[PDB]
């Protein structure tokens, strides 16, 4: 019919239920994506030809290819092998894989951002690469990295809204559900968007506060 937001009020538990789900998808994906990424990074640092090969083509392939196609390739592309994974594990796997790549080169970029002089002083004092790495370089890369991880989580919040098109009940799905019972799209979406906005603000400034308590 026409605009009415107060109608929307007693769908409040839906929006909230959406919000929560968006968080627990995002955490989980990023979490795996971090660990995966960490490990992916370590592969690229090996001097073994095949492993550097495949870690770098994994990274280039995932970053150079849309998130949507990866989600659908996990979901739809795996039916015909007589495997049907839930919407949730599908979305999680897609996001954690994608995030794993972007984390892998967050870490690589955080390392070459520590001044090459540090490594030079370390080596010049007789330390081997391993020791230079443990006692000197990595403790600094870590404080290059944590802010970029925070920023990554913040981007993943927005990105995860894409699991709705697969029928996962995240915060964006709520507009479908509500509209099926109100015939209204505009209002519940405006509300949903504003929820995304507020989340993004919140995490953006606890990330900037964390940055001025770190570095």
């Amino acid at each position: 019919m026409t605009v009415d937001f107060l109608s929307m009020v007693k769908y409040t538990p839906l929006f909230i239920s959406g919000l929560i789900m968006t968080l627990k998808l995002t955490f989980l994906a990023v979490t795996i994506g971090v660990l995966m990424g960490l490990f992916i990074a370590l592969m690229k640092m090996s001097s073994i030809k095949p492993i550097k090969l495949v870690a770098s083509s994994y990274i280039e392939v995932i970053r150079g290819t849309p998130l949507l196609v990866q989600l659908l390739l996990i979901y739809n592309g795996l039916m015909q092998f007589g495997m049907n994974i839930p919407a949730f594990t599908a979305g999680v796997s897609a996001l954690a894989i994608n995030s794993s790549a972007y984390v892998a080169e967050i870490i690589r970029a955080g390392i070459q951002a520590v001044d090459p002089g540090q490594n030079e002083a370390a080596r010049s004092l007789g330390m081997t690469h391993a020791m230079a790495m443990r006692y000197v370089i990595i403790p600094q890369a870590i404080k290059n990295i944590l802010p970029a991880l925070g920023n990554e989580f913040i981007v993943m919040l927005k990105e995860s809204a894409i699991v709705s098109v697969i029928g996962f009940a995240d915060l964006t799905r709520q507009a479908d559900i509500i509209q099926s019972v109100t015939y209204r799209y505009f209002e519940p979406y405006i509300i949903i968007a504003a929820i995304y906005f507020v989340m993004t603000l919140t995490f953006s400034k606890l990330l900037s506060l964390f940055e001025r308590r770190l570095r």
Partner: protein, 240 residues
């Protein structure tokens, strides 16, 4: 002790060292001078293999070290290095800076480490600051601390890559005094510098480099008052 033999170095098509030879015996203070882009710092950094020569060879104590058939950490254990921009470890306190390499590389006892560190801090006059962090250090204090750290690994030669060039002028001479004191105590030193006062006061030898070549060398008085080559005279006329 040091023998750099006819080395060359390239970065891309940019030729920085074009056939250089340098011999240093125990106890010498050798000071290398020249215009920017002469190759001073590159030749200095060939000595402990922070660069690798495209050709030529580097001998430390009669042992070729750029053949890949030798352990480089064992070399740099004996060959110290002080950096233009200090390269202090920012997350470590003063002492910790000094004691890191001896504890983990030489495997020293940690309180024998901390006594070596507190007497080095006393030596360069930083004992009042044992526990501060580098950020709360002045330029002079920083360079003096980098020197303490370098010495804690007890090398037989010290390499100085323009150690005062990034210091406020009121701060140059405290670092210079420390280095001079090292010279007076008999340390082997290769120094690249803009400060000719140092070459005057404690230098045994002065190497004038220009466009990737050693163009003239001699004692400090020979070079500063009686230079024979025309590039040397040009450079000195601009800098003296």
């Amino acid at each position: 002790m040091i023998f750099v033999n006819d080395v060359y170095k390239n970065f891309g098509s940019l030729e920085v060292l074009k056939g250089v030879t340098l011999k240093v015996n125990k106890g010498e203070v050798v000071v290398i001078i020249g215009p920017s882009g002469s190759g001073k710092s590159t030749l200095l950094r060939c000595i402990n293999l922070l660069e690798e020569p495209t050709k030529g060879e580097v001998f430390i104590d009669g042992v070729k070290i750029n053949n890949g058939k030798v352990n480089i950490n064992k070399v740099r254990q004996k060959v110290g290095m002080v950096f233009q921009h200090f390269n202090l470890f920012p997350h470590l306190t003063a002492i910790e800076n000094i004691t890191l390499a001896p504890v983990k590389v030489k495997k020293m006892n940690k309180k024998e480490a901390e006594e070596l560190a507190v007497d080095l801090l006393a030596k360069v006059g930083l004992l009042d600051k044992k526990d501060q962090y580098p950020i709360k250090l002045s330029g002079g204090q920083k360079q003096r601390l980098a020197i303490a750290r370098a010495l804690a690994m007890q090398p037989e030669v010290m390499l100085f890559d323009e150690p005062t060039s990034a210091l406020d002028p009121e701060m140059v001479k405290e670092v210079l005094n420390v280095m001079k004191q090292l010279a007076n105590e008999g340390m082997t030193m290769v120094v690249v510098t803009h400060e000719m006062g140092f070459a005057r006061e404690v230098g045994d030898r002065v190497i004038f480099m220009d466009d990737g070549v050693i163009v003239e060398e001699g004692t400090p008085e020979e070079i500063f008052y009686r230079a024979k080559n025309e590039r040397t005279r040009e450079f000195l006329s601009k800098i003296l």
